[model samples]
Target: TTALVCDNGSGLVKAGFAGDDAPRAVFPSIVGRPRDSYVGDEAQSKRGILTLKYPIEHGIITNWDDMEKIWHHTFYNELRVAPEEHPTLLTEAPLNPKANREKMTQIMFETFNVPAMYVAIQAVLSLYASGRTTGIVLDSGDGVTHNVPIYEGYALPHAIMRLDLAGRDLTDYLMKILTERGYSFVTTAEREIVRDIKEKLCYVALDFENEMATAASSSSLEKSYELPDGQVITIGNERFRCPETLFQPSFIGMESAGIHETTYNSIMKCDIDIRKDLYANNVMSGGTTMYPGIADRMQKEITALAPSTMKIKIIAPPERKYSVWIGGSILASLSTFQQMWITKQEYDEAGPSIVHRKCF
Candidate 1:
């Protein structure tokens, strides 16, 4: 049976059957109500005491009840596939709580009544999707960025690092800068417009100081963006400055290490023998990392921090935005992967604890 794959991210959900080129449905991973009790995208435009809730926070499932609703909508409305029709493959961030795993297992078997399910760390899935077993996977998604080093298909525990900044931070930073200059985009509905602006215009500047100097001198750095209401907005240095947060956390007033420092720090924690391989693969995943010149920029930054003799290779796969889902699709469709799923019978026998033994 073709397995269902769901990459339940904070900003979005990429879900569909396995062995597919891309997810069949990708939507915001939010449940909302406007006192009218509307949910998901439907609540976005509704005014009057609107309450928006996110099921996941910092890559952790915080609101199981609302998550269930999102998943319910996924099976019933989005895919139109009954839960039991196929085994399911779910992806989770590394170091996800044991309780979350058990709860997820319970939800899959008890609520969805799925035939089978298998949960995997998203970074590991991303590694195998890149057709390798040992490397560092630097996955920056909407909620958080994870620097995971995997060797022979297993994630190393000692060196794993998570950064609290990602796409949303960048979007908010962009919005903040734009708001300082102008006033039209402050509404709740306008957040999406700002995110749109960030995704379309934001990029990493290779030479930060040089780029800033260039932008100060000329209007060449600015570009025009048309809003949903037909207001054309020109974004200037805010474009490159937003993404620079990944490399320079100081930009956000957080003295914490930047993405490059996070990567090098992760490698520094690892055993000395395999650090070269970690530096070489340097895999990147998630939609947030898809900004233009990000890979080139990341590679450039890492090279400066890395040893001169050690090679620095940052692999930016073509399908980086949905690489985890694609990896899940690939894994679930494999010959032996069917046998690996934690089936309903197994769950019935061992209960939710079976998840720890099989998946984690």
Candidate 2:
């Protein structure tokens, strides 16, 4: 009795017994060997000698060998559970590539020999985890920001849209900038250091130019950033600088496409009636959602652009990152969930669609 969830964004394969109280194992979508792994408090403290490779790219599994081996070592070895004896639930991204989905199913059913498995997008699982029946799921992961509408625990793909930008892209941009400025840090190593700044320092100034002007003319905008290892550096009023990438990517030499524009595009794709429902249930879920000021920023931006009658909401629980796994665990524990888990017989008789339509 277990649920196996492998999300491409985080490359975190979460698996544990179905009736278990909590998740027993979790690991990154990355792996590396000796002298490569950098220890950060946000992750494992003991820096094992490692060469890290990210198997997934832009929300899909691209690097197969390293990812597969790491998956086995981290999840399988740690859990000590034979795949065939455990019930597993795996999650792919929304509108997951057909080939990628096939490859994933093959890996689980053949390579892992899991007794049961199901595949679906993380957006669906997040909604389930939030204990909500209807809401918009804005999943901003390592690779991209996917806007999905979950109605009754399933996705309305036609309503979903994605932007190429994500946390990883921002990190890369930050790394490039800081490196040029004499900050010796890798993207992975500097993420917590930078993200803490993004969460606390970044803001959507109504009059961005005026704000910058005020900071320039006065010291109002000056702020100090304290690094994780206890090093502190003073930055000018541009403390909100990094996350400006989210809205003003051109500031980082990237094209400008903010969450507001992208989210608006996604909203335009829906029908009139669905649009009405969506505005009212405009729920937000994802790592980016946890970024302080994101909800208010979205609500303000969308409200200004959308119909005045339309309503908007950015809903998220406190433990946002664990929402999907927690929900998958709960879903797996239910007797009704038996219908969703595909047995070997069903897999042989039907096809992957059985798992997709049922579990997802």
Candidate 3:
């Protein structure tokens, strides 16, 4: 039987069959409800008028109706798969609410009539993508930067740590910096353009203080960015400074440890013996971690915090942006994963609550 993998990320949803190396369909995890009815990408053009609503808020599915619509679109319009014929795997964030899980389980069995299903932890999936059952996974996605410690293919929930500083925070900071420089972009669509500019130009500073001093000395750091309307604006330190928030959330008025310290803290909280393994198998996942120099800076920072006797190896795969989805694909493709799936018969007997016992 074919298994379908769906990773419903905060910013986007990656969905496809298990055998595929990558997701076949990737779309925004948002729904546009206009005055008359709801539309997908069609409402993107009408920025100001459309009431845009995201199904997921901070890595949890809050709106089931919109979420259902999204899944329907993914199944029918995008992948063109019949849900009843395939077993499905969905990726979930850390500390998901029990009610939400129960609701999702009910929807899968009652709505889609799927044969079997499984919900895999995003952190475990990320570790799986790196071909390791044990590792420290640093996932900086749209909503949060999560530092999760995995031991023998399972996530250690008590040791997990997360920060609110991530991609969206960086995008907002970029938008603010641009607006202060006399650029006007008030609409959601315009803000999206700003986010794209951030992705294209932003980079982690190896030495933030030195970079700032050097930029102050010379005008060579400045680069002009032209908007869709042919409006050009020169950007200098903002490019590096935007991503600096990931390293120093204080730049954005948040009180939290940086990625490196957080990673160290997460590992230290775990068993003492496992700390070395966690450091050696440090894996980076999610879109925000893809920024240039992030790995280098993290290595330098984390190494300093770690013991002199231990060697730190930060593993960032080439396809890190889609790593969790890839992991789900790999997991579902395995013949041994068949028994792990929560079948319709099991759900029918134990009801939606069976997801807690079967999947988790």
Candidate 4:
């Protein structure tokens, strides 16, 4: 029997059959309804902007109607999967409210009629993806940044740390800088263009002050980027400056710890003996961490703050962007998985409340 692995992220939803190295179907976590006459590819362009609404907000599924549509499209339209014939494993963010889990369980069993299901914490799955049972998972996705410590395959609830800063926050910061610079990109389609600029042009600098000086003194630091409408703009300090907020939330007037300090703070909350292990086994996952120089800068910052004798290392796989989803694939494909899933009959017996006891 096969199983489905789904990682529902804030920006995108990744879903595929178990045992796959990467997600088979990836799409935005939102749906668009047209106000005008346009279908398919043409629909996105001619369809007025207000119809778009993301099902997830800050890693929580808030809009079930759009969320249900997304899941149906992912299973039947994208992957051509027959939900009734196979079990499914879903990955969720750390600290997701209990109510959300119950609602998700209800939807899977009653709406999709799945045979069995399991909800795995994204942080735990990220540890599994790195082939470790203990480590600190620093996940920087679109909506938020989380620092979760896992011990012997279980996430420690008390030690988890989170920051409001993340990819989308950086994108917004960049948009703000651009607007202040007199760049006009207010259209709905322009949002994606700005995101592309962020992905392609942004990089985390090792030394913020030094880099800013270099960005100030050097003319070559500026690069030209072309928008979808063929408008060209020279991007200078904003490239590195935008991503710099991850390391210095103070740059944008937010009072909080940077990713490195956050990791250090999270690891500090753990028992003293395991601190070294958590330090050496730091696993970096999420789409935001894929930016160049992030791993190095993070390693440097954390090392500077850590004990002198302790060794610090950050493990960032080349495919770290899909680490959580891959971990679900690994877990769902295991021979022991048959016994791990909560059966549909069990749900009928206890209702949605069974999720907490069965899955955890």
Candidate 5:
């Protein structure tokens, strides 16, 4: 039997069996104070009445108290799976603090009491979901984007790069200009509606100047996105313009390197001898990377920065949005991996610090 797989990406909670093709349940990663307390979408619905509090930030768990509540809902309430029966496999952010990792090891065995547990870097597992071990994983999600280079199933920390820009920023930017049209989207509730619009209408353009120029004259580019309140909003030129922020952060007034440039710089930072393999497998993962033509745009941007002779490829799985979870499913299902996880026996013998020795 496979372990239960859960991926907490700050933005969403994705969970299912390791052998399952896709996750069984996915919901918002937040909690609300009902003073009756609601979890996940229920909490999201109570946004105005109940004080909504996010426990994870930038892919890191900030408040274990509320985080514990979220997990409780996913297990006892949502999945209804016994915590101690199945070995659990989880995903963690790149360069997660040593303190946090230790705490995670402590909690899984000490509290949840799973017989065997394994926690792998999200980028590494993402590459595995593509059915490969050696690659560069460009994982961009809600709170952060990481250009993590993995070779022979191991990640290189020295070359790993991170950015604050992600899907959240895109939603905010989309909301910003939507108000410029004299339509109101200021409140948190309305922003959720605008997020739906961004996903439906927004796309990354191959040529920024060309797309912007065509928007002026091309009637086809114009689109109508209806709000939940039966109001239709005009969108066209703004569609491509919003996603442009990913390739160019200055669009939203941020001084940070875009995804493609980060990929090239990360590769350049690695040893030149292995650069060829790293260049070949630039894997794409995480929810923010789901936009259409994202791979094509990334390929074009990186090609511009790389040497003419170097071969660069950005591999994107069809289900890149749930890549980290998919990867855990694939890995934990493998018979050989049973021995890979740290057993509760090990934790009982050496305690949480044993994770540093057992897991890298």
Candidate 6:
């Protein structure tokens, strides 16, 4: 069997057959204009070339034409797996559209010569790596918060929750705040810059109103942050102040729903009995959850919002940003996981029917 670990972040297509040190080839999940390479190996931008295609929004694969080609090249060149050689494990986005899934699988078999494939969800893969039978998987991605429930490594259909907000929104919000405060802007070109600031300086406020009060009453904003172009930015009231958006999105005129409230709502959405013991196993995986104070703050929020007797624990990987892929890597390497994998042969025989059965 083989595994493909694709993430919209950095447009990375890291894949190989079963066990390997790393991906055979890492192709950018990018599609540039027809005339030029969608993404150049270097930063030098050529003029008048048509716009680049992100294809994937947040993490969902959106543009099929360009992305299908990227996948074709990736699997064909890197894994060298012909249709007859082996089955395939393709990870699809959590809560991916059914239409997209059918189309994607059709492309894999018809276009890429990958005879069979099982559409694995990223949340399930992470839960598999965690080895937790029951717990909440709170994933903060570039586009949204995916709250998934797992029992015996299988997702509970009725418990899935998605919030349409994530790091990209945070960056955009921060950029707007910067512009409002008279900081020069560079449009979309500065998204990375804004993202970096959000990563390095952003912090979730445990108490939204209290944080705003602190920021308003305090007399400090003297921390100098280094930007991409050898420029240093001095920020004080803004760093912690802006991060409060996670807990207090109202600061940006978004919504007042903090992560705590949302987390509770997500859990409540599960409709399962909230057992006190399982509260200690809350798992936080995703880029945004890597924020410095996110884990601590989430733990507090969940604890307070949860029953007083319930203990909440949030765990992160060493590189929280890459945890999902790493988790997939771990799943890919397990021989026992072969039982859980639905290969090309299996899919061809059953197609999406394979997904409908109990995955055990």
Report how far off residue 227 is in candidate 5 (Å).
2.4
Candidate 6 per-residue lDDT, tens place, 239-309, comes to 77666667766766775466667667767766456545346667777777877767778887788788787
Q: Return the TM-score for each candidate structure.
A: 0.95, 0.82, 0.93, 0.91, 0.96, 0.83
When superposed on Cα atoms, how far off is each prediction in RMSD?
A: 1.7, 4.0, 2.0, 2.7, 1.6, 3.6
- lDDT by residue (tens digit), candidate 2, 1-360: 455554445535555555554557665666664653321122244344454566777677777775566556645465776677776777677787787777777777777777777776777777777667676777776667788876666677787777777766665665556666676667555765765666566555554567678867987776677887788866554454555567676765666467777777777886656676667666555565565556676787888888887777767567676666666767777888777777877777886656555546
- The models' CA-based lDDT, in order, is 0.87, 0.66, 0.86, 0.85, 0.85, 0.64
- Candidate 1 lDDT by residue in tens digits, 1-360: 678999999889899999998999998888876543545676565535577888899888999988998899998889999998789988888889889999999999999999999899899988889998899999999989999999888888879998999888888777788888775567667778898888888888988999999999999999999877787778889989889889888888888888888999999999999998899989999988888888888888888988777889999899999999999999999897777899999999988988876532
The 10 consecutive residues of candidate 6 with the worst lDDT sum are: 38-47
Error of 3 at 266 (Å): 1.2
Question: Candidate 2 or 4, higher lDDT?
Answer: 4
314 Cα displacement, candidate 1 (Å): 0.2
lDDT of candidate 2?
A: 0.66
Rank list by lDDT: 1, 3, 5, 4, 2, 6
Stretches off by above 4 angstroms in model 5 are 34-36, 357-360
Prediction 3 TM-score vs. true? 0.93
Best by lDDT: 1
Q: Provide backbone clash counts, one per model.
A: 0, 12, 0, 0, 1, 4
Instruction: List candidate 4 stretches off by more than 4 Å.
Output: 32-51, 230-232, 358-360
The positional error of residue 318 in candidate 2, measured at the CA in angstroms, is 2.0
lDDT of 4 by residue, 101-210 (tens): 99899989999999999999998888888889899999999988899998888788889999887888888888888877788656656677888999899888888888
